[PDB]
C-alpha cells in the first residue's frame, strides 16, 4: 500500500520463497550463490525499514509500534531461515 507496507510484503514473500525452496532441496546446489545474495539484500532491506521507522518516530503524530512489530517479525523469519539454509547437509 504505502511504500513501507509494500517492502514488508515483498520481504516476507521473498523469505517465504527461499524457505519453500529449502524444504524441497534440503541437501548441501544450483541456487546456493543466489540465496546468499538475496539474503544479504534482505538484511540491507531491513536496515532501510528500520531507518524509515527512525525518521517516522520523530513525527509525534505517528505511532510506529505496528511497523516495529512487523520488522521484528521479518527479522525472526530471516533468522529461522538462515539457520535452515546453514544446516543443509
Amino acid at each position: 500500500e504505502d511504500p513501507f507496507q509494500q517492502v514488508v510484503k515483498d520481504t516476507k514473500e521473498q523469505l517465504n520463497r527461499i524457505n519453500n525452496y529449502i524444504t524441497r532441496h534440503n541437501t548441501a546446489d544450483d541456487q546456493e550463490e543466489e540465496i546468499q545474495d538475496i539474503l544479504k539484500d534482505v538484511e540491507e532491506t531491513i536496515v532501510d525499514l528500520d531507518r524509515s521507522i527512525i525518521v517516522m518516530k520523530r513525527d509525534e503524530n505517528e505511532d510506529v509500534s505496528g511497523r516495529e512489530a512487523q520488522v521484528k517479525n521479518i527479522k525472526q523469519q530471516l533468522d529461522a531461515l538462515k539457520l535452515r539454509f546453514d544446516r543443509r547437509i
Binding site: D2, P3, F4, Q6, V7, D10, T11, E13, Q14, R17, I18, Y21, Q31, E34, I35, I38, T45, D48, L49, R51, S52, V55, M56
Partner: peptide, 22 residues
C-alpha cells in the same frame, strides 16, 4: 526457476524516495 520476487527492487527504491520526502 528464479527465486527472486518481482518488483522487490523497484519497491525498495520507492521506499528510499519516500525516505527523502520525509
Amino acid at each position: 526457476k528464479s527465486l527472486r520476487v518481482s518488483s522487490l527492487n523497484k519497491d525498495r527504491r520507492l521506499l528510499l524516495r519516500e525516505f527523502y520526502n520525509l
